[PDB]
Amino acid sequence: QKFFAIKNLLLLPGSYTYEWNFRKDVNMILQSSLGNDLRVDGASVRFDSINLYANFFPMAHNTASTLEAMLRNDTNDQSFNDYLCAANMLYPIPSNA
Amino acid sequence: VAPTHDVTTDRSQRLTLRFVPVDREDTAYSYKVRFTLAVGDNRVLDMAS
Amino acid sequence: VPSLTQKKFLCDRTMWRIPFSSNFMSMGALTDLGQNMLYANSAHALDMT
């Protein structure tokens, strides 16, 4: 889970809908050695069931509520930076230019 | 002498919480899920795990 | 020819550990779960299968 906003986020409790679009395209979910340019050989995937996990730290209910009622503010608020932190521009170069 | 004043609890809460989908689909090239993860009033989730 | 799979882990040269802390962390030599008001008061026999 590598998206920079939700990568190292600190999540004060509620009920949060969390959608995801996986990819079933066998070409860029696998990887060949020799440049076996797939999707014509017969490779495929199939997903049985995809489950989430999480890991709550057990904080005391008086000291979690001095985190939560102190983190809920306008000045105590998370802010992450992308590492590569850039914008690709993707210019094509035709054959021998 | 690692301390005991209000770090880890007595109040009987879980440690890992697997969630289970709605939005189960299929596509010739795609797949989707969504998870109503509920956490609740306390027990702040760290979102990197 | 069709096949199933087999999985197995290898943990040589080290021992498994289970810390005696209620969050299981290595916060110190003493723990919060080791010097609380329940395990330092009374004697406790353990069964361990």
């Binding site: 000291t63 930076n81 590492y83 850039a86 | 002498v1 690692a2 301390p3 209000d6 | 916060m27």
Partner: peptide, 29 residues
Amino acid sequence: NFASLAPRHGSRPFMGTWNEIGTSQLNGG
């Protein structure tokens, strides 16, 4: 003070350095 949260090495609590509060990890920084 929040001294009842830090894992104390003895009587003095283990209070970290001042670079342990933010980060500046950009590509070439």
